[PDB]
Design a binder for this molecule. Structure first.
Ligand SMILES: C[N+](C)(C)CCOP(=O)([O-])OP(=O)(O)OC[C@H]1O[C@@H](n2ccc(N)nc2=O)[C@H](O)[C@@H]1O
Ligand SMILES: C[N+](C)(C)CCOP(=O)([O-])OP(=O)(O)OC[C@H]1O[C@@H](n2ccc(N)nc2=O)[C@H](O)[C@@H]1O
Ligand SMILES: C[N+](C)(C)CCOP(=O)([O-])OP(=O)(O)OC[C@H]1O[C@@H](n2ccc(N)nc2=O)[C@H](O)[C@@H]1O
Ligand SMILES: C[N+](C)(C)CCOP(=O)([O-])OP(=O)(O)OC[C@H]1O[C@@H](n2ccc(N)nc2=O)[C@H](O)[C@@H]1O
Ligand SMILES: [Mg+2]
Ligand SMILES: [Mg+2]
Ligand SMILES: [Mg+2]
Ligand SMILES: [Mg+2]
Lengths: 228, 228, 228, 228
């Protein structure tokens, strides 16, 4: 009944070079501070101190967080071999009642809560139009579908929460998926998207400047100015 | 009698995620330069300016090529429906005396030529042992067979040329194929390999670091260093 | 106190060629039925028999409507010289308590009513992202702003109603505009968008398949399938 | 110095439904014979064998002509996106000393000649009065002007021949036009009509039953009887 946080931070983050040439993405800094720190401090300040960080590319640079925040680091040796599906596979049983977080995000405000009662997707609305995973939901905010597409709307923004019963249904797809031998290129998120029919997930529309994703030096350049 | 180039680049490139989530594999860059640019600039330098690029997945990202190199982009709306047999089908009439290229390859050296006089496959030798399409030829370099298999040897490496008489035989197979009703999974190469007996094709043994394919983030990791 | 309709239909419809070289867009047919007929029959069925159609390009092809529906056609001789600002100027006095309709739109449902009491824009939400005129409004549905831009949102969809007091303020802008000497490229809609601050306009969100615009032969192709 | 022909046959011919539902316009048949066959055979019998057919809508139904008459087919992928300006753009290099033909015309007689020495328009006289493009020429038959209008006179009838120098002047407009960004709606003929001042084109008055156009099920119904 205690809420923990899983942070996916193993990737190479090649789209951000030269910035990530000798620095993992998660530890890239804005307003003179590492990206992963903002989320760790927001998670702790909200009483979520059970924090597991999946590492890989340049993992030695994370070691100091154990001492500083008391985070549990976990090594994915296949961080360049597979996609983050495997990273989550590694801690596939800690999913229940835990937050899953894409480390490459800048959080403007702390939207975390240990009172969460159901599987949630913390969705921001992209007025523009880029290729993302889009959430298809009604007035009950229950997620009807997830669709990859290029357009505008509410997307999977890199922060979610999975309750025990749903997590259980998910882990069962992870096993089959893994044993299938076909998951290399799969995002852990494919488990939900391709099985959304069997799961009950809800959206939590965020607003204003909240979760800014940095997938390229240009974004880093934008968020830079937004912070002006 | 003018040599033209057809570049296949409409695929999802899923085996390259996350690198290819918001960037076509064809446009992924090595040494701050899109893959497709090395090939186009190589083609041009050798006098081949009649370039037709088939696009689909994230097509909008190719638009700047038109203005920059004077290329022609063609949209395959079934790019996620069918294998690249359909991509070639769309331009099946521009085959004769044209090069056909797999855009997801890195070329170390410009092995192109507008003087080519016969159907050629620029094959590389794979000393290791992976599963590919192996070229079976004698001392005349005339292709005797093409066999899918896991081993070492000379392989279809993503670059070839087709003369008018050969293209004609091919395009006739493409038609029956199309009208057959079944061609979803066929690579356009299934046209040759499955009728190699009726065609006259020659091999052009490449050597050293010539054509480097990136079908996975590891290869992309490798190639990086090779260029160290 | 009687509701009348004003249908703009004088345009060249060049973006629909060849479909429109010998037929006005307003008369192009979907399901063996001219576009303008769907609107007129909907307007009539809800008691709006006071219909005024401005025509120009290929005007002679509208003449049968007079006999068939009892509509009044008004000839805009500058239909190729000026944008529809002038088309409405012609009938700027019949504005009060009347619908203003862009003829080049298909209507899936009859959203016309003779009980309207305030100025309304019947809007559709565009999930994709094209360049249009966007409606900026609150929870009162009172229009706060109208912006030209390319994105998603609620857009002016070619159907609106204007009440006496609002029509009065608008007609006063038309006059000044006309006598200003510059109005060649102005949509009649410019009168509202550029004085939205002095006017009280409300939105009436439309849902589902309601108002489909055919501004190109592709759309005409789409709408085709939609009705599959 | 060899004369070739370019037949434009990519459009959708919607105005001809139901006749063109599962048949391209060029392959709608009169006297159990496809329209494009009459023009191909007249063109051959006069020694013009260098025939390039531009296809699109239902293109597969043309493949047989390659074997049968040895015509070269060409695929315009934007056949429903743009007007035939683009279709001609694809082969803008084969214009010089070549006939340009609108495949939706029934030829009563073979007015083709490989001896042509100057840009020509094989004009017919319409005693009636429809909206078409009219040739304004003097007694020297040199075209002074082309004007869209609704009346009687000599029109652009769907057959013409262009010489090297004129075609050279026309191709330079085609280029600026394309790079302009706006041609989406231009007929290839717009190049001639909106530049007629810079070109030397002549008229070749046809007489009696020569070229009958089928743009609608009404025309087809007429021609039917004329042949009675
Ligand atoms: C498509 N989605 C919405 C499901 C997720 C989008 O993911 P993406 O395309 O931005 O790629 P990304 O690598 O930046 O994914 C974000 C998170 O996955 C992590 N990651 C990636 C690959 C890998 N083997 N292990 C990981 O832990 C990254 O470090 C990063 O923190
Ligand atoms: C099996 N062979 C030897 C014939 C070739 C190997 O082909 P492959 O297995 O690497 O799969 P692949 O999808 O990468 O094929 C390479 C090229 O096909 C293109 N491609 C693929 C599918 C599709 N519908 N259209 C395409 O244009 C890709 O963009 C890529 O440039
Ligand atoms: C820009 N908006 C949002 C104000 C409206 C969009 O208008 P549009 O860009 O689609 O151009 P359009 O020509 O289709 O305008 C729609 C209506 O105006 C009519 N029209 C246009 C010009 C003119 N001189 N007289 C007219 O009556 C057309 O016939 C058509 O029924
Ligand atoms: C206005 N003119 C005089 C310039 C030509 C008249 O042209 P039209 O109004 O009869 O329309 P149309 O679609 O029949 O044009 C005739 C020829 O263009 C071809 N066509 C049309 C659209 C397109 N993208 N490519 C084409 O090649 C048609 O197949 C047809 O054979
Ligand atoms: Mg990311
Ligand atoms: Mg490949
Ligand atoms: Mg319109
Ligand atoms: Mg015609």
């Amino acid at each position: 009944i205690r809420v923990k946080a899983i942070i996916l931070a193993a990737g190479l983050g090649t789209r951000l070079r030269p910035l990530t040439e000798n620095t993992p993405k998660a530890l890239v800094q804005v307003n003179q501070k590492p990206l992963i720190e903002y989320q760790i401090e927001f998670l702790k300040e909200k009483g979520i101190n059970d924090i597991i960080i999946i590492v890989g590319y340049l993992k030695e640079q994370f070691d100091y967080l154990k001492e500083k925040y008391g985070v549990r680091l976990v090594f994915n040796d296949k961080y360049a071999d597979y996609n983050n599906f495997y990273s989550l596979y590694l801690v596939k049983e800690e999913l229940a009642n835990s937050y899953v977080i894409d480390a490459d995000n800048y959080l403007f405000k702390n939207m975390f809560r240990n009172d969460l009662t159901r599987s949630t997707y913390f969705s921001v609305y992209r007025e523009d139009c880029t290729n993302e995973w889009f959430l298809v939901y009604g007035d009950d905010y229950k997620v009807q579908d997830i669709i990859v597409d290029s357009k505008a709307g509410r997307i999977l923004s890199g922060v979610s929460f999975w309750d025990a019963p749903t997590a259980e249904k998910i882990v069962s797809f992870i096993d089959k998926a893994y044993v299938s031998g076909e998951f290399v290129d799969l995002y852990w998120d494919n488990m939900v998207k391709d099985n959304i029919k069997e799961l009950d997930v809800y959206v939590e529309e965020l607003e204003g400047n909240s979760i800014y994703e940095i997938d390229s030096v240009q974004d880093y350049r934008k968020l830079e100015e937004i912070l002006k």
